[PDB]
């Protein structure tokens, strides 16, 4: 694997688990060791090969009871302070998945793990606006579970991660308002962090304990999808290594059942989480999912709701005067309120008047013709301007985003709305001479190359149209074309 | 075709056009008369066969210009009191599809198209609410067009349509409340009705007019897509017959690019609406489905903020209250103001509280225990209960529609709303005793039959949950599993 490959990797079967603990594999009901890892011997005071071996003969009747009983769904059981016939105590991770029965070994802490959680939930359940829920959530996270760094990553619409948050060591260098590209997290990583909540790493530099055998019999690998020793890529760990982070906790933020994001924990040190304070932790996760999903939606709702006022206020003005067109020419710049643009424009009667970041005058009769030809009386937006208009390029930096919206069912007029090129609107917040040691595979895996890779496959490009903003240009286009047949 | 073959029937390619105009389809670039409808010559005053003959022959070279310089998309171009080289006077409707130019003829009327549009638009566009608009439409498109019935059919998830307004003649039967399964419109039909803004039937019980060739070299047969003079369904035409209906206008409500539903006028006489008339008509059309897209939009809106408004209610309250099941066993009543339901109950603690309709109390813990079981902690709902468990048919005339809310993450207590059986909520206006001649494909094209089909299509089956149905109760999972965490 490197760096041609690893965006086909297949990390659900590495062959190998994490050295905090040890797994053994067995048949979908529990009767045969079918897989063990290297480790399992030293950990649970175990001679030779335990493959072969009967589940009872390995763990002892009394556990294997127990563990068959649990597993009554793909979700993890979790069962902490079990004792080994030996003596030995364990908090056990069992789940069942490929009709193979899966069961992680963790030396074990005792904590009440509902009680740490409930602490953190009412801290954050009284937030009123996603940025309030944001900004608390890492400093949270941070003086509870004792991260060096906690990030909350949210992922855009082409796939790319921004930092929205950050609660740091003061020493550390800040990733605040940085962009990663897609491939920083490519699909099948975004897959396994649908289907698992949280996820360590607890040493990047850390030997990695190998499954034996590694390939069956049928020449099937064992898919550790859904378990937490489950062995990291090469790749990110070489990436991990050259920020300094040692050790990492990861939670996925699941917003209407898809990936809104992560929240990223990083330590400069190596560091286990114990499986109570775990359980606290993937708790937190759902719950900040849930809340962030309701202010998501309040937002919305709010967001139309002031469009709809704003409209009802402009009928309700248009009804008064005669002219309709001396009207919009006073009132346009006033619908840059509805949906946030860095310039808006009017184009009624082969007349333009411009307001904000808008293209030059010569440039818009060109954009004028264009967007009669391919809106056909409905809205049109593009975050690519010169994609569409390659000679657009040449005012990026002002207007690379546009929407149009058509405001006459019989002549060709628009209301234009222009967003600069998303790089003009960072309020990057990190250091720009902070170097970064390298690996094998080179200064790729930097979070300085990694920037400089975004900002490559973003040039000439602005900030997406939101479907929020596609609907209210809607309803502004239904409004406008409604009171302009009425004046007719 | 008949009754068995009806769903799959070519009605796009009839190879036959209306009595009411003739019909010129030409070459890609209005050069060569490829096919003509056989009235071409009764009408235009032309001798024999016109296929072959060049356009400037048949037409003559002032008119031909006319054409191809209008003909600059499939949206048919409209262009009323056009002269042939004769001196007759026609309104011309000419469109371009699969790369064919098909050009029809209209004896032409003397009216003002946007005049008439703009009267009617001006009633409906101040109209405050769905109900508002719809009622006042029927009634002002009958008062303004003439037409003997006008209905507005709305569109099921199922397909199935519902006549939720109606302005008629006093001596005509109403079909107020009364739904009509998805088959009565085949999935071909509700495509050109996606194509094509409204429809024309001048005569149910006319003679159609052939096109010459039906199938040209190549095997190819004339599209009538775009074409407002295409001919009937035969089994359609018998519908309308066997009703008594002799004219038909019809007219597509698109909101949010979807078939919502038809403005559907009929007449007891033959009956053809001019040129002028259709544009007019065919404009309202538009207007009326941006203002009930603005409408239902708004309607949404005030349905999920009542909802989350109920809810910081209910939070406000749990906050005071020390006990959270006693404060839900008083208040769950209440939770049937977010959601439409015919009753709603609280399983908390294995115990039952019901209110309206619910099913019977020994029913509950089989039906709990069956949430339990598939719920998996999310929103889980059903319009058809006994489709899900066989027994629950024993009391569908009470509840054979149920949406549960888990209210807990740890327990699994729940919140079920129910619906009656839809057919026990039937405002049905109209004659049962009320009988219809049929024809030779006998009573299953009657409005009676119909009627009696969707009602066995629908036994046992509640109005399904909408999309801010299952929005509200995913508000309302979180806001109740976040306080019951709170309360642990
Ligand atoms: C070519 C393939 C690459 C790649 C693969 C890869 N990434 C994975 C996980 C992952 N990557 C990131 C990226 C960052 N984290 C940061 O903090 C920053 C910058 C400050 C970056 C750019 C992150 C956050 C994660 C964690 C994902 C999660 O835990 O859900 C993985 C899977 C790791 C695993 O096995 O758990 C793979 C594979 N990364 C590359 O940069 C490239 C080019
Ligand atoms: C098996 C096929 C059948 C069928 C086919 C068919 N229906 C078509 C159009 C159409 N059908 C209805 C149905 C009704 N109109 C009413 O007023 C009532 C009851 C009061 C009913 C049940 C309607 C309204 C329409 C008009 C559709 C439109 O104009 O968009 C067509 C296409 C007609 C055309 O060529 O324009 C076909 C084909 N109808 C059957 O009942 C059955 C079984």
Redesign the interface.
């Known amino acids: 694997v490197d760096l041609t490959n690893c965006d086909r990797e297949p990390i659900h079967i590495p062959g190998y688990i994490q050295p905090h603990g040890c797994l053994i594999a067995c048949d979908n009901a529990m009767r045969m060791v079918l897989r063990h890892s290297e480790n399992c011997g030293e950990l649970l005071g175990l001679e030779g090969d335990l493959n072969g071996r009967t589940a009872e003969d390995v763990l002892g009747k009394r556990l294997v009871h127990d563990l068959r009983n649990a597993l009554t769904?793909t979700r993890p059981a979790m069962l902490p302070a079990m004792e080994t016939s030996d003596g030995r105590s364990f908090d056990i991770s069992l789940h069942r998945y490929k009709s193979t029965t899966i069961i992680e070994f963790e030396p074990s802490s005792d904590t009440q793990p509902?009680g740490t959680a409930?602490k953190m939930?009412?801290r954050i359940?009284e937030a009123d606006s996603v940025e309030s829920l944001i900004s608390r959530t890492t400093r949270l996270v941070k003086a509870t579970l004792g991260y060096d760094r906690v990030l909350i990553y949210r992922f855009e619409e082409d796939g790319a991660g921004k930092v929205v948050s950050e609660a740091k060591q003061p020493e550390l260098e800040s990733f605040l308002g940085q962009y990663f590209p897609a491939s920083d997290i490519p699909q099948q990583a975004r897959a396994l962090y649908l289907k698992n909540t949280l996820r360590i790493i607890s040493d990047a530099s850390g030997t990695p304990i190998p499954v034996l055998p590694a390939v069956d019999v049928s020449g099937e690998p064992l898919d550790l999808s859904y378990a937490h020793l489950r062995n990291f890529s090469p790749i990110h760990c070489e990436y991990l290594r050259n920020m300094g982070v040692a050790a990492s906790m990861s939670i996925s933020v699941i917003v209407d059942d898809a990936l809104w994001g992560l929240i990223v924990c990083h330590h400069c040190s190596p560091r286990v989480l114990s499986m109570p304070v775990r359980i606290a932790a993937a708790?937190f996760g759902?719950?900040f999912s849930?809340?962030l999903?309701?202010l998501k939606?309040?937002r919305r709702?709010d967001t139309?709701?002031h469009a709809?006022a704003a409209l009802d206020r402009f009928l309700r003005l248009a009804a008064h005067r005669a002219n309709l067109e001396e009207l919009l020419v006073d009132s346009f710049q006033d619908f840059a309120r509805l949906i946030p643009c860095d310039g808006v424009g009017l184009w009624v009667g082969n007349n333009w008047h411009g307001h904000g970041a808008t293209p030059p005058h010569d440039a818009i009769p060109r954009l004028a013709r264009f967007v009669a030809s391919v809106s056909?009386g409905r809205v049109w937006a593009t975050h690519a301007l010169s994609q569409a208009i390659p000679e657009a390029e040449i005012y990026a930096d002002t207007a690379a985003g546009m929407l149009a919206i058509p405001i006459s069912?019989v002549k060709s007029d628009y209301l234009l709305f222009f967003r600069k090129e998303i790089v003009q609107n960072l309020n990057w917040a990190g250091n720009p001479e902070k170097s970064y040691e390298t690996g094998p595979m080179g200064d790729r895996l930097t979070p300085r190359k990694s920037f400089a890779i975004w900002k490559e496959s973003v040039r000439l490009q602005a900030q997406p149209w939101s479907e929020a903003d596609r609907?209210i240009a809607?309803?502004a286009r239904?409004?406008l074309?409604?009171v302009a047949?009425?004046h007719?």
């Open positions: 769904t509902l409930r939930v009412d359940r708790m759902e719950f849930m809340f999903q309701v939606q309040k709702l139309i709701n709809h056909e069912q609907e809607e309803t239904i409004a074309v409604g047949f009425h007719s």
